[model samples]
Target: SSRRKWNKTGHAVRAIGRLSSLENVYIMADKQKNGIKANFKIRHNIEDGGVQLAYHYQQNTPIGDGPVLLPDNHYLSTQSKLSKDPNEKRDHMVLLEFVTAAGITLGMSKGEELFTGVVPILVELDGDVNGHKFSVSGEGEGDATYGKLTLKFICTTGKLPVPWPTLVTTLVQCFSRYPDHMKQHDFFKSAMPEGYIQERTIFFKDDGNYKTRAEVKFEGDTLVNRIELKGIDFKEDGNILGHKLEYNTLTEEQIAEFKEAFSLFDKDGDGTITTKELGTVMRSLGQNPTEAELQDMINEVDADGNGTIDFPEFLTMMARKMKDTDSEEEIREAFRVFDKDGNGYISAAELRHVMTNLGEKLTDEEVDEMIREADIDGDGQVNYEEFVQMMTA
Candidate 1:
């Protein structure tokens, strides 16, 4: 009855509803890297089919000196570098517009069946504090996406505002659990310090019936709140607290078909792949790398130098390898589709024509904007070279 088959998403959904409510959530902003601790309060509302996050600094956080003013007519806007001197100011805010596209996959480990995959969270930063508009593409974590939610591209064109920092912290938590773990989390701590506050404490209200639990700690300058959830009867649409539910019971076996390759690498049955295992993994995948090359790969990612890649590290490696697997010839095959008549280039008209039937459609002006982007020579068409640059860059 739903748009998607809620198999793995079932447990995922349970994990989701827990974050259905939040109050006065504030994280530490960058001080030395970006110069000032830009202050603001984030409002999260899981509306209709999408999640909405409204960010404005001063008005909401009556606790700060002054909120960064978002644009009057923009859904996404720019941020300015304010001075920190007695005669100067330091304030900035990021207005983010997110269109979430989510999907789930199953990964098996020992006795535990896993749920994980990358969900692409699209964002358009529309405000212009500096002189350009930016578009950010960051990945989702865990069942939220699969591997780590890493930021990929940032476009600078004199259209929208500069892509500000700290917004990703607010955005990632909206869809999945935080603190960094399935139990209590981390990734966002030292990198962007979202855990320390001054005075008041925040609460984690369990919907319907669940124990009320809340913990707060004083770290640097701000306060950090911990909200942890356990497995519960949270199968709303079909099975998302996830005490590990498989809503897609029918696909359970087939899903294992997907993770079998991963499980194969864990021949020791310890739920992890060792350095020796890497040899066969690459071999089975038809990659015969030198021993030194193999060592180089693990050293870069073996978190504690433990000599074995844990499940999480493996997923990150998979994601990284997947990213590198895209070939230019493969991209050219796609470029051929938009290029149409084989004139060796893609015209604005052809792009508009081909994309109209595409639900991920764009208006004529927008298509022209893309054309102008890769058309570095400016003759008004995207040749294979230009198109390659557009895709690869």
Candidate 2:
């Protein structure tokens, strides 16, 4: 029989069952040595947001058991090999390859090019060396058919810390929390037969609160490197709020991106930034900040105070806050703070005190809500940062 020619007359596309096959996922730990192998299967689906097909290649076979859908959205797939000497105690490596591609059919269409934006793979580690927990995150652009694309997850295990198992488990849990992630990956693969796209690896140590590091190779002359100290013991809350981190450290151009983000946040023409100003800026950008939030921003941006937000400080604040609010609007709203009390502290009683002095008697509940509004941190007290944000709000 002659090879069949696939046509795109309909809105949806289906994969040929016979063409399905399994492939080994591999990672390069060393340039001198062969890549380590991983197991995976080829699969297909109708785009989730596209016209649902009555028939699918997976429906007839075990490989296509889930939803008969293709990602009706564009996706970026990055590939990296787990780096570690199986013989070593805690050595690991990850290599990133692939950045962008033109029109590539994802089994649904013969021609469709999806764009992948510059994205960084994020991982947060928790638990002790005996029991471990992790959270991984990343984002990019695509169509609404695929919906708001996001990948985030929290996983914990009592198993020993090996490299691939830790990486794979975290990945599996992430996809499980968001099944669309797997579907999206499949569509991207079908569209582009070329192996994985971009990839990176993060190294975790026995001490839960030690510094973590990872590297990513960008297209052209740029390489992104990240270093973070997680689970540090602060006198305050013990939550593993990543202590310190640096992104894209290789080239000056990449470093400029960090500087630019700060300029955007330093609202007041004054070289110094107040908590109120930070809150206002974040609110304008759709981040909701509570009274306590300004302090958080200030803590990150206004290190030396002098009242202004510098480049490094602002970038650090933005990087951390961006994860909390997904949308620019939401993020802004979440970063808003309003403290009318000149007392420099924002509280229900104090806010109500200020409002009453201004000839407005806010109800007790309203006052409480108002305080909570700007109190991004659960702490009942409000500080200068919260007040500054409120001024902006």
Candidate 3:
């Protein structure tokens, strides 16, 4: 088996499966609303280094036969890869679109009147990878042009290939390809659940190629006015390559954390982050970049092949910025950045400017109070020591 050739890392990916009964799935539109629960299948490919997650939940269950599992019409399905963007920082970046076959036609509808659009996301993957078991949970808001869809999945997984049964995985796949003829199906009799209604019809050519068509409809009854149908459009690691979306992803505290970690790693003052240095820092943080030679870790971390990691290079390595970058470090870098004039003090004007620029526009009075409170010696300015006291306060 190809998995046999993969080694320990392969065991890690295969061991991922859901451990929750109700996994929340969402399709946010013009307004907020309750999302549905879904059955999920995580298909992870070690070689490809991506997880193809599909949420299988039926809107309506048959009166007696239960919900018919269809492969093509899954309520939600997406591919995600561990973000390589050392700075943007995250677990997995959900893609925007899937590879579609040509000559495929899709028809969609919801209630009487309708609406449409696209969104994006980042879902964090967690749990014990080498332990042959793991879990994943993600919460992010995909900003649509006018509106946005926020998806949060507090999910955990078991081992790989968690028995995805319909009738059977293969049977379900083929059965979906040829559905029962649409004879006398109509919309809900008169009244139904007080949620949004959406329908989609797709046409596919026998042989996949370069043509496709889709019809979509969406309507809301109580509050939701439009629908957000996200189309993921990125290959595995490539999405993180261009969009330096880190501004949206990284918090000020996290940036501070990275700086602190970097300083610690290069404590030798030689600018070289050696293997042993990484071990000390790793314990201070968490996990190795790999299970193998770790020569690979250095090689990968050694941007442009310098043999050892230069401090700034750590900014680019996913290994150093692991999930453990939280709380332990808060350096003067935080204070220094605040001291824009570099005159060892924070003036009212500087505080107000910072407050507006990144502090979300604090009132001038608030800025005045902030500096006044930090002015322990009554100097009308926030000295480094006083600034530290204020922060601790």
Candidate lDDT (C-alpha), each: 0.39, 0.34, 0.36
For model 1, the superposed segments whose C-alpha errors exceed 4 Å read 1-326
- Kindly indicate the candidate among 1 and 3 with the higher lDDT: 1
lDDT ranking, high to low: 1, 3, 2
Ranking by TM-score: 3, 1, 2
Candidate 2 wrongly placed segments (more than 4 Å): 1-67, 76-317, 320-337, 341-347, 350-393
Residues 34-122, candidate 1, lDDT per residue (tens digit)? 21122333332232333333333311111222222121110111111211124312222222221111111111011011223333333
**Residue range 114-182, candidate 2, lDDT tens digits:** 222223334444433223343333222222121112232223332323322223322311111112213
* Model 1 C-alpha lDDT versus the unseen true structure: 0.39
User: Which portions of model 3 show Cα errors greater than 4 Å?
Assistant: 1-56, 60-195, 198-330, 357-363
Report the lDDT of model 2 for residue 216. 24
Candidates 2 and 3 compared by lDDT, better number: 3
Model 2 poorest ten-residue lDDT run: 52-61
| Model 3 per-residue lDDT tens digits across residues 1-393 | 666768766666656533343223222211111212223342322223543333333232212222222222222222222222345333332211111011112231121121122222333333221133334444443321112233433334533212111111111000011101210121221112232233221111111111111111112322221222212223323312122122112333454465455655664644356677666554433345543455667876654354556434554463354332342245376677667788998899877766454314467788788887678899899888887677655
Q: Model 2, clash count?
A: 52
Candidate 3 global CA lDDT score = 0.36
- Ranked by TM-score, the better of candidates 1 and 3 is 3
